[PDB]
């Protein structure tokens, strides 16, 4: 499985920014499916995730109530939708995926087989 990202650069604090990644439309298919995120030097750090079916989510502590991750596995794409964006929101979004056989939530990077080259969102004044 290819994961590709969408969406980024500069965005402004206070608004919102939609990501989306782009996954396998072919034979092989993601499970599970997330976004981290990596602030500079640190480690990719889990930001949202979402089970194979869409069914179950979950979301970092600072993210939740306004960050939402959805799917539509018809289209083999997944999205982020950040919401009042804030300055700790800078960091490299990746996206991410199990392996089809893993269908849970994705909330480890243990769990995850399949990684996007990510893409930089900076959120200035
Ligand atoms: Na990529």
């Known amino acids: 499985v290819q994961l590709q990202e969408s969406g980024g650069g500069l965005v402004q604090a206070g608004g919102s920014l939609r990501l989306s990644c782009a996954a396998s439309?072919?034979?092989?298919?993601?499970?599970?499916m997330a976004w981290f995120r990596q602030a500079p030097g640190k480690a990719r750090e889990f930001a949202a995730g979402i089970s194979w079916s869409g069914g179950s989510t979950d979301y970092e502590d600072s993210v939740k109530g306004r960050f939402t991750i959805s799917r539509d596995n018809a289209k083999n794409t997944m999205y982020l939708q950040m919401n009042s964006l804030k300055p700790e929101d800078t960091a490299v979004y990746y996206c991410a995926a199990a392996r089809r056989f893993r269908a849970g939530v994705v909330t480890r990077a243990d769990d995850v087989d399949y990684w996007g080259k990510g893409t930089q969102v900076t959120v200035s004044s």
């Open positions: 439309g072919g034979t092989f298919k993601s499970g599970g």
